[PDB]
Amino acid sequence: EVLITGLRTRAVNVPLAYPVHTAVGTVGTAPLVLIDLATSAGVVGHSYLFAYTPVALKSLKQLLDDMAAMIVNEPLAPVSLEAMLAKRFCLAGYTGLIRMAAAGIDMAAWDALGKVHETPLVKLLGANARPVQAYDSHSLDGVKLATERAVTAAELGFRAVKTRIGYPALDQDLAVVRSIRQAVGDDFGIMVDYNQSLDVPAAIKRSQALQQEGVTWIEEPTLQHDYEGHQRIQSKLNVPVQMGENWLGPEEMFKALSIGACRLAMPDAMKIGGVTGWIRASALAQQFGIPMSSHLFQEISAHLLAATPTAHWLERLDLAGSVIEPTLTFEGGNAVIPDLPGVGIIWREKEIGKYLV
């Protein structure tokens, strides 16, 4: 009955509202691939993929264009499509870029499904829309800018910020945390992200000093793939260890949870396998007793978390704002699902034209 009839992809480099500071330098643009999934019913599903670095952007788009042939003419049934792709790529390696690509199709396919039934994605998954608490995600900004950005966030109504740390000296990490605290008061959440930059012993030492400061969570303290090493750092902390943005598929999350690597999880809608992967990851999180937050893709995450038993926080990081209408709104620090079928992503065609690669 409803068939997929085409796939069109466009690679852009969009400006970021909040340039992200890093050890290297400032990055003011995001490399995205926009996807349009056409169907025999006259509706188009939409989604986007984040490439992380301009180095992979063209390659990601080419991969997607080359896979269009496997999905054109298949029924618009995301669970069954996902099983087919996992089988086609079983030798090449259903992970990395290939898995991300497939996740792109899944999210667009679900968006079209919601449109066929004229219903918001959240409702198609069987849950009600509810606002989700969100925190504003900042970067490796230095004491002054980090403080400045936190003050603005509280001004906009957020009740928590995420800062990135990992300066050369521990003393610099703490300066930043303290300056934020002083300007925002003691209620306020302050999440901190190490972005995989420390070895285990250094992680235990810096984390215990931070725990004494009062942070909400300690995220990705060491190499993302070393589960066992995250479990060792967690074993010496009261504050929770957060991770999950880099799990490629729920079978990687299962491995890390099976070992006790962390006390909080934050899957990335794209890497986790789209809507289909997320539903799976949510069942796991529920059973292991782990609060689950999101990483990027704020548009679809708002819907995904509402249907997530252990939902915890939504990460506000607006990558695609320049090319999409602002249908997701934040009120009182909570993300509010818009009442539009699918995920509610609507392109600003005019602008996309400017950033085309």
Ligand X SMILES: O=C(O)[C@H](O)c1ccccc1
Ligand Y SMILES: O=C(O)[C@@H](O)c1ccccc1
193 lines the binding site for Mg ion (CB under 5 A): yes
Which positions from 69 to 108 touch its own copies by CB under 8 A, shown as an x/- string? -x----x-xxxx--x----xxxxxx-xxxxxx--------
Burial 63-79 (b: 16+ CB within 10 A, else e): bbeebbeebeeeebbbe
Instruction: Output the CA–CA distances (angstroms, integers) from residue 156 to 136, 160, 186, in the order listed.
Output: 10, 11, 18
Nearer CB in complex with ligand Y: 299/315: 315
Torsion of CA 197, 203, 207, 208, to 10 degrees: -160
Nearer CB in complex with ligand X: 2/84: 84
Q: Does the CA dihedral 251-256-259-260 come out positive or negative?
A: negative
Stretch that binds Mg ion, among 27-35, 36-44, 188-196, 305-313 (CB under 5 A): 188-196
Residue of 115, 138, 280, 303 that binds its own copies (CB under 8 A)? 280
- Whether 234 and 241 have beta carbons less than 8 Å apart is answered as yes
- Whether 204 and 181 have beta carbons less than 8 Å apart is answered as no
353 in helix, strand or coil?
A: helix
Give the DSSP per-residue string, 62-87: HHHHHHHHHHTTSBS-HHHHHHHHHH
Task: Return d(Cα 116, Cα 1) in angstroms, integer.
Answer: 11
Nearer CB in complex with ligand X: 30/343: 30
Q: From the list ligand X, its own copies, ligand Y, none, which binds 255 (C-beta under 5 to 8 Å, kind-based)? A: its own copies
Q: From the list its own copies, ligand Y, Mg ion, none, which binds 137 (C-beta under 5 to 8 Å, kind-based)? A: ligand Y
Which positions from 63 to 102 touch ligand Y by CB under 6 A, shown as an x/- string? ----------------------------x-----------
Encoded tokens for 308 = 């997530």
Taking CB under 6 A as the criterion, which residues in 88-117 touch ligand X? Answer: 91
Residue of 7, 11, 14, 30 that binds ligand X (CB under 6 A)? 30
Q: Which residue is nearest to Mg ion (CB)?
A: 193
Tell me the β-bridge partners of 160: 189
Q: From the list ligand Y, its own copies, ligand X, none, which binds 30 (C-beta under 5 to 8 Å, kind-based)? A: ligand X
Encoded tokens for 65 = 């264009």
Task: Return d(Cα 299, Cα 316) in angstroms, integer.
Answer: 10
Nearest approach in angstroms of CB 149 to ligand Y is 14
Which positions from 292 to 331 touch its own copies by CB under 8 A, shown as an x/- string? ---------------x-xx---------------------
Q: From the list ligand Y, ligand X, its own copies, none, which binds 283 (C-beta under 5 to 8 Å, kind-based)? A: its own copies
Task: Return d(Cα 201, Cα 205) in angstroms, integer.
Answer: 6
Task: Return d(Cα 121, Cα 282) in angstroms, integer.
Answer: 16
Nearest approach in angstroms of CB 89 to ligand X is 10
Which positions from 118 to 157 touch ligand Y by CB under 6 A, shown as an x/- string? -------------------x--------------------
- Which residue type does 22 have? T
Taking CB under 6 A as the criterion, which residues in 146-205 touch ligand X? Answer: none
18 lines the binding site for its own copies (CB under 8 A): no
Tell me the β-bridge partners of 15: 29
Task: Return d(Cα 46, Cα 274) in angstroms, integer.
Answer: 13
181 lines the binding site for its own copies (CB under 8 A): no
The footprint of ligand Y (CB under 6 A) covers 91, 137, 193, 195, 245, 295, 315, 317
The footprint of Mg ion (CB under 5 A) covers 193, 245
